């Protein structure tokens, strides 16, 4: 006959979400070429047009320098594979500097200020092959079986 | 100036289409199992339920015995990869006796009344591996880019 | 001259992302028969559809306070010229898209 | 003199779907049958038939 009150907390992050409102820069004059990319994964630049002024990007592969991370957008993205993706032949929202949430494949929390190493598919890994100049921003969390890590980005 | 009038002819048939109103038979108490079936290709039976009465069918593979050919239906099909198919876990119209138009991979017209040889993927092809008890009904046409052939089906 | 040689329609909404249209077809045949016949041929019909997309365009310009004051005093402002240049750039981009296309954007 | 003929098929589900959506399927098949008859007549007049003399 006694009443019961309960309490629940929200999750703090989603893949490809901008971590906070610090100094950031979005490179939005790019176009997806040769396939599709995942929100929360790194991309590489294929070529930059001399006159038209659009860069050509795709998912990261072996032996390629990353350029940025795709970020969430409720308008520019299409829903496929139960998640947000960017389809081929369309404008993309690439983040080049700032704090972002990234998909992870590691199993242990990282160290603040250490260098970020990626996997061959553009996802963070504690023992990846591709080396970057980015550093960890401190965040490390999970959303319903999806691991997320907070990454600091600076311009190339 | 002098007026002009023109003339055009329709196509003859479609993949998985009933050829004529001869004595046919349709089995509609079947369900697609583990995959999808192209309209106009042969199917095989993997299991007949002892008491429930339904039959489990799937696309033809190597070293099996064909049972029938899927036919066109505007209501009980799904439009996928620009063709019309039967999807997994759904009722399927399977024709077990009569004349039907089906896909072909051959290059020359066949002989009337001779035995039909099917390919491993379930489409008719000369000098094929799988042997049936079906005979050619004398039909050799073509849609815009699809080869078709008329086959006479006898019940197993 | 691309909006003056090709028709312009105003059906799409300002908040749409894709449009689509349909097409239909049919087949069939006939034959010469006898009085006792059981194999009359049949007919059918078809359908198909297509797709199209929409794109956004943009640019910008800068100006300082000293230039604003100099334009106000000398009688020749510098901001209106830049606004005209921006409008001309947009129109020329539309014309170039119509008459030359864009390979990366399909 | 000669005779011509064909036929078409339909099911109850297709009839109901055509009534509900607004695009019936039987009218298109009837039109196809009539067009096939007319085109066969035209072919006989202008192209002829060898087995039928």
């Amino acid at each position: 006959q006694i009443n019961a009150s309960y309490q629940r907390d929200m999750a703090i992050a989603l893949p490809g979400m901008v971590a906070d409102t610090s100094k950031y820069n979005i490179d939005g004059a790019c176009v997806v070429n040769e396939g599709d990319v995942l929100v929360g994964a790194a991309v590489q630049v294929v070529q930059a047009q001399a006159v038209d002024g659009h860069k050509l990007v795709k998912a990261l592969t072996t032996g390629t320098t990353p350029y940025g991370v795709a970020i969430r957008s409720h308008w520019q993205t299409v829903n496929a594979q139960n998640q947000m993706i960017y389809e081929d032949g369309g404008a993309i929202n690439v983040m080049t500097s700032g704090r972002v949430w990234m998909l992870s494949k590691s199993t242990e929390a990282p160290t603040f200020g250490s260098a970020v190493k990626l996997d061959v598919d553009g996802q963070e890994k504690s023992d990846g092959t591709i080396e970057t100049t980015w550093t960890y921003a401190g965040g490390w969390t999970k959303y319903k079986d999806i691991q997320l890590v907070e990454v600091q980005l600076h311009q190339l | 100036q002098i007026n002009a009038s023109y003339q055009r002819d329709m196509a003859i048939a479609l993949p998985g289409m009933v050829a004529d109103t001869s004595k046919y038979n349709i089995d509609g108490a079947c369900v697609v199992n583990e995959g999808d079936v192209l309209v106009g290709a042969a199917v095989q039976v993997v299991q007949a339920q002892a008491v429930d009465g339904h039959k489990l069918v799937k696309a033809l593979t190597t070293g099996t015995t064909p049972y029938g050919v899927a036919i066109r239906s505007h209501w009980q099909t799904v439009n996928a990869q620009n063709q019309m198919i039967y999807e997994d876990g759904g009722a399927i119209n399977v024709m077990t006796s009569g004349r039907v138009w089906m896909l072909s991979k051959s290059t020359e017209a066949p002989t009337f009344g001779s035995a039909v040889k099917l390919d491993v993927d379930g489409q008719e092809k000369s000098d094929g591996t799988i042997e049936t008890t079906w005979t050619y009904a004398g039909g050799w046409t073509k849609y815009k880019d699809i080869q078709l052939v008329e086959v006479q089906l006898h019940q197993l | 001259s691309a909006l003056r040689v090709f028709p312009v329609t105003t059906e799409l909404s300002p908040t749409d992302k894709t449009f689509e249209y349909m097409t239909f077809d049919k087949v069939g045949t006939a034959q010469i028969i006898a009085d006792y016949t059981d194999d009359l041929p049949l007919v059918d019909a078809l359908g198909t559809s297509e797709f199209g997309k929409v794109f956004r365009l943009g640019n910008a310009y800068l100006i300082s306070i000293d230039e604003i004051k100099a334009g106000q005093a000398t009688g020749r402002p510098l901001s209106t010229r830049k606004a005209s240049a921006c409008q001309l750039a947009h129109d020329q981009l539309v014309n170039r898209l119509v008459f030359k296309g864009s390979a990366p954007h399909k | 003199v000669f005779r011509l003929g064909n036929a078409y098929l339909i099911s109850i589900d297709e009839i109901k779907a055509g009534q509900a959506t607004g695009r019936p399927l039987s009218t298109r098949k009837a039109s196809a049958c009539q067009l096939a008859h007319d085109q066969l007549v035209n072919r006989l007049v202008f192209k002829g038939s060898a087995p039928h003399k």
């Binding site: - | 003339q7 | 239909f24 | 085109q39």
Partner: peptide, 26 residues
């Protein structure tokens, strides 16, 4: 499942005009 709040059908336009093939009789 981390989709968005709007589906495709809500931001899609269906043109109200169909095209038919032409088969003249003769």
């Amino acid at each position: 499942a981390t989709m968005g709040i709007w589906t495709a059908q809500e931001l899609h336009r269906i043109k109200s005009q169909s095209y038919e093939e032409d088969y003249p009789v003769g």
